[PDB]
Write a protein that binds this ligand. Structure first.
Ligand SMILES: [Zn+2]
Ligand SMILES: [Zn+2]
Ligand SMILES: [Zn+2]
Lengths: 75, 15
């Protein structure tokens, strides 16, 4: 499978793209971003189209596509 | 701000 490219947007409206494959557990994405923002992953909620992204959600389960957006808010 | 692309397993890759 190919990597798809998602855009993760933070509270400050800054921008980080992540590449994942369609069956990758998005907790790996959460961890990396939380680590890059210098905050505990559990202090954050990651939303796809307003819907909460579970640790074991995959882009396939959520119906994600290239250039889809993940929004990060405070928990 | 520069473009940032992180690969969750080279950021140009698609496989
Ligand atoms: Zn693209
Ligand atoms: Zn960009
Ligand atoms: Zn590879």
């Amino acid at each position: 499978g190919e990597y798809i490219k998602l855009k993760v947007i933070g509270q400050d409206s800054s921008e980080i793209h992540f590449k994942v494959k369609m069956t990758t557990h998005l907790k790996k994405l959460k961890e990396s971003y939380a680590q890059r923002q210098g905050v505990p992953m559990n202090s954050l909620r990651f939303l796809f189209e307003g819907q909460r992204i579970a640790d074991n959600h995959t882009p396939k389960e959520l119906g994600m596509e290239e250039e889809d957006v993940i929004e990060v808010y405070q928990e | 701000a520069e473009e940032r692309v992180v690969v969750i397993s080279n950021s140009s890759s698609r496989y």
